[PDB]
């Protein structure tokens, strides 16, 4: 079946044999080849259109840098916590040899909850000016490994109401380890990071939105091509 | 107990070689490099695992 016509025919055959998630009878017809177990639920597998412009990195804590292991840190930031779900990271590099990552979070639970609700409910064109102040928590040493292929890793998100599953590409993996600051460099350390960072929520500019749409035009041109 | 050892290091002021003697005192945690010709003395702290190479490297770093 090396014939290009055969490959194309296989492609349309695979496309046509997709099982309707609402079809309970056809879903029960499908049986696991080895487990011999009926199917219960199904989800469509689709890519995500609004997120391809952004760049996604899998961030992990290595060893003692675990937030669960750091009991005082967890107690201060809350024993899922919205503060963790709204944290900010600031990579700063003095020189090629010296590098670290700065972590910021919202200490107040009410402010973090309001910010998380506003961020997760962005489906309209009205955003309130939430001047949220982020407080520094800790710094970690960082190393990065890049993926040779574009879609080497992909994260899967679900949507039960639409019976879909949206996946997003992962560009690289960032690892963080606990770093003990040398006592002889605290003078420059105090001049590197900041005690607070203020985030202001504003609607994206028209030019930046057009740039992001042009970037997304590679994936979906039917709904985003410039005219 | 102070330990006196003859070392083959090179003095950076007189340029004579094989005229360096390392004196380390583990009791007071100190190490002295003295030039047998220049009579210059270099003092640096030492640890439990310190060796004459450690004091020599410390002297090299101090020199530059």
């Amino acid at each position: 079946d090396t014939n290009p016509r055969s490959q194309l025919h296989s492609v349309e055959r695979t496309f046509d044999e997709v099982i309707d998630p609402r079809n309970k009878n056809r879903l029960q017809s499908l049986i696991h080849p080895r487990k011999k177990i009926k199917a219960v639920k199904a989800w469509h597998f689709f890519p995500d259109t609004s997120t391809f412009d952004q760049v996604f990195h899998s961030l992990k804590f290595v060893g003692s840098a675990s937030l669960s292991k750091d009991r005082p840190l967890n107690e201060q930031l809350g024993q899922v916590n919205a503060s963790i779900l709204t944290s900010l990271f600031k990579p700063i590099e003095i020189n090629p040899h010296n590098k670290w990552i700065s972590l910021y979070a919202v200490t107040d639970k009410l402010s973090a909850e309001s910010f998380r609700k506003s961020f997760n409910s962005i489906k309209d064109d009205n955003i309130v000016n939430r001047h949220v102040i982020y407080d520094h928590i800790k710094d970690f040493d960082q190393m990065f490994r890049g993926h040779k292929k574009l879609f080497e890793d992909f994260a899967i998100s679900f949507d039960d109401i639409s019976d879909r599953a949206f996946f997003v590409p992962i560009v690289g993996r960032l690892e963080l380890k606990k770093k003990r600051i040398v006592p002889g460099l605290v003078d420059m350390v105090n001049r590197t990071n900041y005690a607070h960072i203020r985030m202001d929520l504003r609607n994206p500019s028209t030019q930046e939105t057009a740039i992001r749409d042009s970037r997304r035009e590679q994936y979906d041109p039917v709904n985003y091509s410039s005219i | 107990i102070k330990q006196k050892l003859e070392t083959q290091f090179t003095c950076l002021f007189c340029n004579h070689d094989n005229s360096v003697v390392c004196t380390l005192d583990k009791k007071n945690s100190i190490g002295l490099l003295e030039c047998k010709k220049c009579n210059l003395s270099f003092q640096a702290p030492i640890n439990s695992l310190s060796q004459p190479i450690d004091i020599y490297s410390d002297w090299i770093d101090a020199c530059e």
């Binding site: 060893g63 003692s64 | 695992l49 060796q51 190479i53 450690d54 020599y56 090299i60 770093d61």
Partner: protein
Amino acid sequence: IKLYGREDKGTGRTIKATLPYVKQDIPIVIVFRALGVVPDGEILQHICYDENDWQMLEMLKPCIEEGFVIQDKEVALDFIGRRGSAALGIRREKRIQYAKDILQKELLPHITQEEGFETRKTFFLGYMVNRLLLCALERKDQDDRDHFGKKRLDLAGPLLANLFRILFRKLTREIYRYMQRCIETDRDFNLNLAVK
């Protein structure tokens, strides 16, 4: 990886590792920090796999106590480089680079050679230390030297390969020397005369 200290002798039972192109033995905690794992909890995670095994922990205690003096990656690399049997008087930056060279390469070369790929070396050091302690605690019999499953036989292939590698390196050196001698004339050497 030698385990010093006899039964009820030699005070602590320190563990000193031996590295290639290094004149003196080095305690295991120092080399672990040199690879880039400075906290002690992470090192214990790398070595042991059961926190209830207090015997191996108390065996490891003297090593941690001895290596407590070094508490950073760069200082550990400098300590490794100082004894690296290289030229005397090497600057601190060049000493650290020499240590990185001798640590990435020539240290368990069969595992890897590329940069940023040293976690596997740390895990293998943990495995070796685990095996050493496990046999020291008499929990397992020492590996049988006569076990025929641990032997290999070199047939005509490997023997001829070794000999040919030696001879071809000799031929390459001869070509190099002839090229250096003959470039002085700036002539278009046939390259059919350089070879012997």
